[PDB]
Homo-oligomer: A and B are copies of this chain.
Amino acid sequence: RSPWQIQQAVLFALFLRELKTRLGGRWLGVFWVLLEPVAHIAVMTTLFSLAHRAAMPSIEYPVFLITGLIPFFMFRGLVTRLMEAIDSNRGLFAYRQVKPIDTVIARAMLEISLQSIVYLIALGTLGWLGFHFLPVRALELAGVSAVLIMLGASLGLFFAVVTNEIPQARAIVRISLLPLYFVSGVIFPVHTIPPQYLPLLQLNPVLHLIELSRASFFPQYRVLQGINLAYPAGFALLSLFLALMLYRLRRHQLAS
């Protein structure tokens, strides 16, 4: 019994276990999770269509909005469901060979698969409406998406380990996520905001990731200066190393 096989078995068990809780018992969670993006699409198209037309006459609003909104939804879902993974299955730690990291990565893979399904469905229904859906450069888009996924999972694991025996921190990080919706410039193009506040907004790694994903997805998309992948890549690597180190240091205390 090598550790890899039992790890895979318990990961599959936790994954389907999470899938049962997250999705509805009547197999209807997909309906709400598909309603979440379309409401934002509707309100932003009815609220900022002419503003985007004044912004640039090159890319239509729906595809440009989806290609940034869905990765942001993946990021926020990874952070939120990863920070609550350990303090949701306290009883399941009674069995041997369970561990908390297995729970957090089962939730991570469930969120990744679900949001990948949502992204594929959105791309399909976008191509069914006569829009442009095929990525011009798919390899760079895949790399950017992988970096964003790693950053989100790392931040979620860090918040899960650090904020043990203090639920109240979990209450405030969520309120930190709300301005990040507008700071990241997912809704409106960042080319319109004046440079007077650009550098303070260049410290958001998800901003760089979103612009690079849009640049790799669209043909002839102008990326402004200081949107290198090096800064979010280093941020993700450092945060992942820090979170893994903190989990390794506090291992038996997290199980309880």
Give A contacts to B, CB under 8 Å: 24, 28-29, 32, 35-36, 39, 43, 46-47, 168, 171-172, 175, 179, 182, 197
Asked if B171 and A32 sit within 8 Å, CB to CB, the answer is yes
Cα-based distance from A29 to B169 in the complex (angstroms): 11
Q: Tell me the minimal C-beta distance from A50 to chain B in angstroms.
A: 10
Question: Known contacts A32-B171, A39-B175; can you find 11 more A-B pairs with CB under 8 A?
Answer: A24-B168, A28-B168, A29-B168, A32-B168, A32-B172, A35-B172, A36-B175, A39-B179, A43-B179, A46-B197, A47-B182
A179 and chain B: residue at smallest CB distance: B43
Q: How many copies does the complex hold?
A: 2
A183 and chain B: residue at smallest CB distance: B43
Q: Tell me the minimal C-beta distance from A199 to chain B in angstroms.
A: 14
Cα-based distance from A76 to B29 in the complex (angstroms): 25
Residues on B with beta carbons closer than 8 Å to the beta carbon of A197: 46
Residues on B with beta carbons closer than 8 Å to the beta carbon of A46: 197
Cα-based distance from A32 to B175 in the complex (angstroms): 10
Residues on B with beta carbons closer than 8 Å to the beta carbon of A35: 172
Q: Tell me the minimal C-beta distance from A36 to chain B in angstroms.
A: 6
Q: Tell me the minimal C-beta distance from A20 to chain B in angstroms.
A: 13
A178 and chain B: residue at smallest CB distance: B178
A47 and chain B: residue at smallest CB distance: B182
Residues on B with beta carbons closer than 8 Å to the beta carbon of A175: 36, 39
